[PDB]
Amino acid sequence: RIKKISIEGNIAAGKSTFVNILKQLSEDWEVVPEPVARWSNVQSTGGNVLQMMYEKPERWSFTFQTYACLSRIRAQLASLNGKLKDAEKPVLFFERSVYSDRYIFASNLYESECMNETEWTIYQDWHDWMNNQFGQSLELDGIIYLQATPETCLHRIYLRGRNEEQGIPLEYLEKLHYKHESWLLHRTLKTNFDYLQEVPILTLDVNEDFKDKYESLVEKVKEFLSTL
Amino acid sequence: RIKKISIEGNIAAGKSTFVNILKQLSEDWEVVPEPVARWSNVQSTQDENGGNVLQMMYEKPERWSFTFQTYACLSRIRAQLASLNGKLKDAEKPVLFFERSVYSDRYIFASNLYESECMNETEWTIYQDWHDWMNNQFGQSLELDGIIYLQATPETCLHRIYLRGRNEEQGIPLEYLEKLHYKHESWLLHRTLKTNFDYLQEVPILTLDVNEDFKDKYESLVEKVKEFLSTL
Ligand SMILES: O=c1ccn([C@@H]2O[C@H](COP(=O)(O)OP(=O)(O)O)[C@@H](O)[C@H]2O)c(=O)[nH]1
Ligand SMILES: O=c1ccn([C@@H]2O[C@H](COP(=O)(O)OP(=O)(O)O)[C@@H](O)[C@H]2O)c(=O)[nH]1
Ligand SMILES: O=c1ccn([C@H]2C[C@H](O)[C@@H](COP(=O)(O)O)O2)c(=O)[nH]1
Ligand SMILES: O=c1ccn([C@H]2C[C@H](O)[C@@H](COP(=O)(O)O)O2)c(=O)[nH]1
Ligand SMILES: [Mg+2]
Ligand SMILES: [Mg+2]
């Protein structure tokens, strides 16, 4: 019975950065980071299935997207049962969606011919099902679109220095950025999950370095939150 | 209220052949076959010609062992779960026969493919958690009440595989069948296969020797089933 909100955007736009700005001096706010740490070592509930994916996508992209998405829905679900339901005015923020996996990233790869048509049918059969009983409660109350041009994104992918993702072309980020605008701005993107069409969208321009200029966005979120 | 019973055995032992003799036998009896149909042609799940993932897994197992086993298990979990909600729930002595359980998927077919090196370490690591957590979530509904093992020599299975005519599996070596036979015997007969799900060790099994052609001489066996069920 908490306000579940997704912090969405591109590769190193600054999601995890703002997620940690929000984790701070907000007792009624706790964040759920995408398991990009647990995708790096694949062990018992290591091996790098993200690097394997980035390396031979026309091979591991499917195995990966499946593990990636499962790890999300596992962590997301588990967070609420525990944590702090008792607090009076709670908000739980999710680094990425279960939807962004299927509709922006896994779709992207399929189109980029990394996912065999039959790999795509399976992924979808799987996803449309995982989010029925497990992603039942786990439904969204709002999405925060951290907008950043693919241009800055690329500099900030290096600025990070994550080696698996250093061989990323602007053209890739560019093709992602378009799936984003199509989903969260223009809203031309059509999903199987029909409630998602109506839910709110706070667009924030994170092109301008917000590391020590966070105080404005946080006001604009506190606003967006009063709404829901 | 619904008794759940697994019909287990090696490839082409006579699971469906046996399960259809019992489906006819009573009104309070119903079967849940394995979705080999949706594996042969992978479709978009529509209600009011897709690839063959089983053929893919066969011709190049290095590549489709994991992909198939995941789909295979999902489709099973999906199908089974569906049967319980069906209209036959209100009856006196209603049983359910399942063509293979979610345990044979992992502990026989998936594990062997990992032993045969077709599926890599991290491919295996992923499978297991997935199968664990997924199965554990909403687990109570699917617990078996008993298992029926249809015992046939790997050579009988090779004959029945040929008797069937499944193009894709017409290349299955004796050794493959021989390997799977050992994993069934280990689990369902010698009862030495340790599985994560602990309830299993306490479920009653009924082993039958389908080495002789039962399409005709089924009378003896059924009566055994009937009495095995009276003791559940
Ligand atoms: O105001 C900011 C926010 C982020 N970053 C850089 O952006 C990356 C962090 O982005 P993050 O991983 O948080 O975003 P996500 O990957 O979740 O999109 C790193 O390179 C940071 O140094 C930056 O330089 N200034
Ligand atoms: O006593 C028997 C049992 C089976 N079969 C044939 O053997 C093949 C494999 O049987 P089935 O599909 O039932 O085996 P399963 O794969 O279900 O264990 C089929 O063509 C059956 O008609 C047969 O001729 N006689
Ligand atoms: O559905 C997803 C989600 C994430 N990623 C990868 C992209 C990034 O390299 C890595 C971490 O995400 P960012 O925080 O860098 O966006 O996750 C995918 O490939 N597919
Ligand atoms: O978990 C499974 C289940 C089935 N099969 C294969 C073996 C058979 O060729 C076919 C199913 O038919 P029978 O098991 O009914 O023979 O799928 C597997 O490899 N793994
Ligand atoms: Mg990240
Ligand atoms: Mg069969």
Author numbering:
A (entry chain B): 20 to 64, 78 to 260
B (entry chain A): 20 to 67, 77 to 260
Paper text:
In the present work, we identified deoxycytidine kinase (dCK) as the target responsible for the sensitisation of various cancer cell lines to gemcitabine, using reverse-proteomics. dCK is a key enzyme in the nucleoside salvage pathway and recycles bases and nucleosides originating from the degradation of RNA and DNA to achieve the biosynthesis of deoxyribonucleotides, which are required for DNA replication and repair. Hence, dCK is clinically important because of its relationship to both drug resistance and sensitivity.
The designation ‘open’ or ‘closed’ relates to the compactness of the nucleoside binding site. Moreover, it should be noted that masitinib and imatinib were able to open dCK in situ, since we were able to obtain these 3D structures in the ‘open’ conformation by soaking the protein kinase inhibitors in a ‘closed’ dCK crystal.
